[PDB]
Design an enzyme around this catalytic site. Structure first.
Site, PDB file in Angstrom:
ATOM      1  CG  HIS A  93      -8.831   1.519  18.647  1.00 62.08           C
ATOM      2  ND1 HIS A  93      -8.020   0.370  18.512  1.00 62.08           N
ATOM      3  CD2 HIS A  93      -9.846   1.437  19.699  1.00 62.08           C
ATOM      4  CE1 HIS A  93      -8.453  -0.384  19.646  1.00 62.08           C
ATOM      5  NE2 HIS A  93      -9.486   0.264  20.472  1.00 62.08           N
ATOM      6  CG  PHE A 112     -11.006  -2.473  15.003  1.00 64.19           C
ATOM      7  CD1 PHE A 112     -12.480  -2.285  15.140  1.00 64.19           C
ATOM      8  CD2 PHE A 112     -10.134  -1.885  15.897  1.00 64.19           C
ATOM      9  CE1 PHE A 112     -13.004  -1.292  15.959  1.00 64.19           C
ATOM     10  CE2 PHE A 112     -10.927  -0.727  16.786  1.00 64.19           C
ATOM     11  CZ  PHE A 112     -12.363  -0.637  16.602  1.00 64.19           C
ATOM     12  CG  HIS A 120      -6.115  -3.199  17.342  1.00 64.44           C
ATOM     13  ND1 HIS A 120      -6.169  -2.313  17.940  1.00 64.44           N
ATOM     14  CD2 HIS A 120      -5.432  -3.921  18.348  1.00 64.44           C
ATOM     15  CE1 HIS A 120      -5.535  -2.142  19.171  1.00 64.44           C
ATOM     16  NE2 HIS A 120      -5.137  -3.343  19.493  1.00 64.44           N
ATOM     17  CG  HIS A 139      -0.636   5.470   4.578  1.00 61.44           C
ATOM     18  ND1 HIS A 139      -1.165   4.694   5.439  1.00 61.44           N
ATOM     19  CD2 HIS A 139      -1.012   6.663   4.760  1.00 61.44           C
ATOM     20  CE1 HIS A 139      -1.898   5.496   6.704  1.00 61.44           C
ATOM     21  NE2 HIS A 139      -1.761   6.524   6.052  1.00 61.44           N
ATOM     22  CG  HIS A 170      -1.618   1.078   1.470  1.00 57.17           C
ATOM     23  ND1 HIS A 170      -2.750   1.786   0.512  1.00 57.17           N
ATOM     24  CD2 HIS A 170      -1.946   1.918   2.533  1.00 57.17           C
ATOM     25  CE1 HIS A 170      -3.194   2.853   0.999  1.00 57.17           C
ATOM     26  NE2 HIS A 170      -2.728   2.914   2.176  1.00 57.17           N
ATOM     27  CG  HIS A 196       2.312   0.016   5.184  1.00 57.49           C
ATOM     28  ND1 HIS A 196       1.189  -0.835   5.183  1.00 57.49           N
ATOM     29  CD2 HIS A 196       1.690   1.304   5.197  1.00 57.49           C
ATOM     30  CE1 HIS A 196       0.155  -0.030   5.377  1.00 57.49           C
ATOM     31  NE2 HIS A 196       0.524   1.315   5.382  1.00 57.49           N
ATOM     32  CG  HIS A 248      -2.696  -2.731   3.432  1.00 51.74           C
ATOM     33  ND1 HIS A 248      -3.734  -3.711   4.183  1.00 51.74           N
ATOM     34  CD2 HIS A 248      -2.977  -1.424   3.599  1.00 51.74           C
ATOM     35  CE1 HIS A 248      -4.519  -2.695   4.658  1.00 51.74           C
ATOM     36  NE2 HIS A 248      -4.088  -1.473   4.428  1.00 51.74           N
ATOM     37  CG  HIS A 254      -7.854  -0.445   8.341  1.00 49.28           C
ATOM     38  ND1 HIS A 254      -6.489  -0.300   8.970  1.00 49.28           N
ATOM     39  CD2 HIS A 254      -7.359  -0.313   6.815  1.00 49.28           C
ATOM     40  CE1 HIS A 254      -5.464  -0.099   8.096  1.00 49.28           C
ATOM     41  NE2 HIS A 254      -6.115   0.034   6.864  1.00 49.28           N
ATOM     42  CB  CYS A 255      -7.854   0.188  14.002  1.00 47.68           C
ATOM     43  SG  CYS A 255      -6.682   0.547  15.349  1.00 47.68           S
ATOM     44  CG  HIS A 256      -2.605   2.398  10.004  1.00 49.17           C
ATOM     45  ND1 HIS A 256      -1.255   1.479  10.104  1.00 49.17           N
ATOM     46  CD2 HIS A 256      -2.793   2.576   8.659  1.00 49.17           C
ATOM     47  CE1 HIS A 256      -0.744   1.538   8.617  1.00 49.17           C
ATOM     48  NE2 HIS A 256      -1.561   2.334   7.904  1.00 49.17           N
ATOM     49  CB  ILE A 257      -3.269  -0.761  16.245  1.00 48.37           C
ATOM     50  CG1 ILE A 257      -3.098   0.577  16.808  1.00 48.37           C
ATOM     51  CG2 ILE A 257      -2.678  -1.847  17.009  1.00 48.37           C
ATOM     52  CD1 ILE A 257      -3.872   0.759  18.252  1.00 48.37           C
ATOM     53  CG  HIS A 309      -5.515   4.613   6.788  1.00 43.97           C
ATOM     54  ND1 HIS A 309      -5.147   6.205   6.255  1.00 43.97           N
ATOM     55  CD2 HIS A 309      -4.953   3.955   5.831  1.00 43.97           C
ATOM     56  CE1 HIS A 309      -4.811   6.039   4.990  1.00 43.97           C
ATOM     57  NE2 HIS A 309      -4.685   4.801   4.767  1.00 43.97           N
ATOM     58  CG  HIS A 364      -6.978   2.753   2.281  1.00 40.72           C
ATOM     59  ND1 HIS A 364      -5.997   1.955   1.616  1.00 40.72           N
ATOM     60  CD2 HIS A 364      -6.910   2.317   3.646  1.00 40.72           C
ATOM     61  CE1 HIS A 364      -5.125   1.202   2.522  1.00 40.72           C
ATOM     62  NE2 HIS A 364      -5.880   1.371   3.662  1.00 40.72           N
TER      63      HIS A 364
HETATM   64  C1  LIG Z   1      -8.129  -8.300  23.438  1.00 43.37           C
HETATM   65  C2  LIG Z   1      -7.108  -7.520  23.375  1.00 43.37           C
HETATM   66  C3  LIG Z   1      -6.453  -7.210  24.404  1.00 43.37           C
HETATM   67  C4  LIG Z   1      -5.478  -6.174  24.382  1.00 43.37           C
HETATM   68  C5  LIG Z   1      -5.347  -5.454  22.958  1.00 43.37           C
HETATM   69  C6  LIG Z   1      -4.350  -4.478  22.916  1.00 43.37           C
HETATM   70  O1  LIG Z   1      -4.265  -3.868  21.925  1.00 43.37           O
HETATM   71  O2  LIG Z   1      -3.647  -4.160  23.974  1.00 43.37           O
HETATM   72  C7  LIG Z   1      -5.996  -5.816  21.983  1.00 43.37           C
HETATM   73  C8  LIG Z   1      -6.945  -6.835  22.142  1.00 43.37           C
HETATM   74 CU   LIG Z   2      -6.975  -0.256  17.128  1.00 47.44          CU
HETATM   75 CU   LIG Z   3      -1.067   2.787   5.805  1.00 47.35          CU
HETATM   76 CU   LIG Z   4      -3.603   4.079   3.504  1.00 49.72          CU
HETATM   77 CU   LIG Z   5      -5.441   0.164   5.209  1.00 45.39          CU
END
Ligand SMILES: Cc1ccc(C(=O)O)cc1
Ligand SMILES: [Cu+2]
Ligand SMILES: [Cu+2]
Ligand SMILES: [Cu+2]
Ligand SMILES: [Cu+2]
Ligand SMILES: *[C@@H]1O[C@H](CO)[C@@H](O[C@@H]2O[C@H](CO)[C@@H](O[C@@H]3O[C@H](CO[C@H]4O[C@H](CO)[C@@H](O)[C@H](O)[C@@H]4O)[C@@H](O)[C@H](O)[C@@H]3O)[C@H](O)[C@H]2NC(C)=O)[C@H](O)[C@H]1NC(C)=O
Ligand SMILES: *[C@@H]1O[C@H](CO)[C@@H](O[C@@H]2O[C@H](CO)[C@@H](O)[C@H](O)[C@H]2NC(C)=O)[C@H](O)[C@H]1NC(C)=O
Ligand SMILES: [Ca+2]
Ligand SMILES: [Ca+2]
Ligand SMILES: [Ca+2]
Length: 496
Positions: free
Chosen positions: A394, A460, A455, A66, A64, A109, A111, A449-452, A397, A399
């Site tokens: 969270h 997510f 997750h 970004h 991707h 990065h 994806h 989506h969450c970019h963690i 992001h 796109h």
């Molecule tokens: C279930 C669960 C627990 C902790 C987290 C986190 O990112 O800290 C994410 C999911």
């Molecule tokens: Cu998240």
């Molecule tokens: Cu990105």
């Molecule tokens: Cu992006």
């Molecule tokens: Cu993405």
């Protein structure tokens, strides 16, 4: 730097960015992944050659770019099983797109799954020869790109499903608590010169509070959007965000600590962890002994505004748009949910589903995760913070779009007149109701989506299927894209 026309060869190899060695992902035989640059208006032709042999970090890949809108090139956007099937090992795929109307600081990065955490992630700069901020600084080149990254001693699929980082890397280097003598990044400046530093978060999870001892920072860009200048003494930067700031190198010739405090893992600077060095020309080649003073002027997102003072799309009242959506976060059976649905990658990429004849969100898989958006419409999305989705705040992001952040985290106010625009926004903590607006001028399925990354892997995400009837006509696909899925689907699981 390389680009805008370049080969990017992806391979596996051992790396030691915090003085401990592990197998990871190399791009053009190097870690961290190399800087790519171009100018505003350029055509990017990035030939991704996949030579990976390690199934634990995934042999396949997808990249991707970004922050790029990808108008008419939705097929090049990168998300696996949304915009393409992955590139298979032993094959190559050309991403060919234009950036007519954008300039600033971007990144690339993997994806596919949690693969970018294993090392496929690097900065991109698109220079503007008529940059409205250009006369504020003397130096803006490869040496002024500053990346932040989390680093793990165990690979993404080897450690905990939601791991904690062993080190923060700055420009690819940092110390862990057990490697206190590891190499540190040095950024050199000349007294009396002015620098545009481009700060890029390559993080898979943590956010970082960034500061430089003895120096203030004049922020001029957020996520590829030009801002009215805002001087600050610290910046809390979330995963995938970018800022440009001007640094006037006007302090005494010496060594000053650059600090990037993560929100998890090692939350101190003992032994030079979470740190790099700002060194003035003529200073002794030693570690800084400077002290951190309390941040009395931190960056506040709600106080940021665009250079042009662009209004939010729609009318200046809640719901003053063509379509308003609320995203209710949750967590069930170890998976994240948005409005009761957890994203699981479909066998047929969402874009391919549309090109094959899917006509509505109800037709699109995964069911419950896709939202159909009308063309040429003002959209408002609220993403109220909740502890029901663990691991907050969270950073979401979108796109294909920049969006107006009409309400930021930590603020109760709405700004329709001159809000910051960006592409990754922290949705904050309970009590917050981060709200964004954008215009549907870009047909295609776009991830939200969450970019963690951990997750995202746990579901997510939703897909915004923008102007479904016009997707095929607006996004003609190259032959090589059409061949990705038959090649990928022919692989045995162990070669994926
Ligand atoms: C279930 C669960 C627990 C902790 C987290 C986190 O990112 O800290 C994410 C999911
Ligand atoms: Cu998240
Ligand atoms: Cu990105
Ligand atoms: Cu992006
Ligand atoms: Cu993405
Ligand atoms: C391709 O990709 C992979 C990911 O980079 C590679 O995975 C590596 O493979 C081995 C197993 O073959 C690992 O070594 C093992 O590590 C575990 C865990 O070690 C940690 O935890 C234990 C228990 O808490 C602790 O005692 C240790 O001190 C460590 O903190 C050990 O239990 C095993 O005995 C063994 O040492 C690697 O950790 C792993 N590296 C990656 C970065 O996760 C793989 O090698 C690659 N394949 C090709 C052939 O190179
Ligand atoms: C945050 O934002 C949205 C939009 O302002 C909220 O959902 C709306 O709120 C009111 C009252 O419940 C209704 O008139 C609308 O039907 C809602 N619009 C959206 C499209 O559903 C929401 O209440 C807020 N959530 C947090 C907890 O404050
Ligand atoms: Ca050194
Ligand atoms: Ca320099
Ligand atoms: Ca820009």
């Amino acid at each position: 730097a390389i680009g805008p026309v370049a080969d990017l060869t992806i391979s596996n190899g051992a790396v030691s960015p915090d003085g401990f060695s592990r197998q990871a992902i190399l791009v053009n035989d190097v870690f961290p992944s190399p800087l790519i640059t171009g100018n505003k208006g350029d055509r990017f032709q990035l030939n991704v050659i996949d030579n990976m042999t390690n199934h634990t970090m995934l042999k396949s890949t997808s990249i991707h770019w970004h922050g790029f809108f990808q108008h008419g090139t939705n097929w090049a956007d990168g998300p696996a099983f949304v915009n393409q099937c992955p590139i298979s090992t032993g094959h190559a795929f050309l991403y060919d797109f234009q950036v007519p109307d954008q300039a600033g600081t971007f990144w690339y990065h993997s994806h596919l799954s949690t693969q970018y955490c294993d090392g496929l992630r690097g900065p991109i700069v698109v220079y503007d020869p008529q940059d409205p901020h250009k006369s504020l600084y003397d130096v803006d080149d490869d040496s002024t790109v500053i990346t932040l990254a989390d680093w793990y001693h165990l690979a993404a699929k080897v450690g905990s499903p939601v791991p904690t980082a062993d080190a923060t890397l700055i420009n690819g280097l940092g110390r862990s608590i057990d490697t206190l003598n590891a190499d540190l990044a040095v950024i050199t400046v000349t007294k009396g010169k002015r620098y545009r530093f481009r700060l890029v978060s390559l993080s898979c999870d943590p956010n970082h509070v960034f500061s430089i001892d003895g120096h203030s920072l004049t922020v001029i860009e957020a996520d590829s959007v030009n801002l009215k200048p805002q001087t600050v003494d610290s910046i809390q930067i979330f995963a995938a965000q970018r800022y440009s700031f001007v640094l006037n190198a006007d302090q005494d010739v010496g060594n000053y600590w650059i600090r990037a405090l993560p929100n998890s893992g090692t939350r101190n600077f003992d032994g030079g962890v979470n740190s790099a060095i700002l060194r003035y020309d003529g200073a002794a080649p030693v570690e800084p002994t400077t002290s951190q003073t309390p941040s009395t002027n931190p960056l506040v997102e709600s106080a940021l505004t665009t250079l042009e003072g662009t209004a939010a799309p729609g009318s200046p009242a809640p719901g003053g748009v063509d379509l308003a959506l609320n995203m209710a976060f949750g967590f069930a059976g170890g998976k994240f949910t948005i409005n009761g649905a957890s994203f699981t990658p479909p066998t047929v990429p969402v874009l391919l589903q549309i090109l094959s004849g899917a006509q509505s969100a109800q037709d699109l898989l995964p069911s419950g995760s896709v939202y159909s958006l009308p063309a040429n419409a003002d959209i408002e999305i609220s993403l109220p913070a909740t502890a029901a989705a663990p691991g907050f705040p969270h950073p979401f992001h979108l796109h294909g779009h920049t969006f107006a952040v009409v309400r930021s985290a930590g603020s109760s106010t709405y700004n329709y007149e001159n809000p910051v625009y960006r592409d990754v926004v922290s949705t904050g903590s309970p009590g917050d109701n981060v709200t964004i607006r954008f215009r549907t001028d870009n047909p295609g399925p776009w991830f939200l989506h969450c970019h963690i990354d951990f997750h995202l892997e746990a579901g997510f995400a939703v897909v915004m299927a923008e102007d479904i009837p016009e997707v095929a006509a607006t996004n003609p696909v190259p032959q090589a894209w059409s061949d990705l899925c038959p090649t990928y689907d022919a692989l045995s699981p162990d070669d994926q």
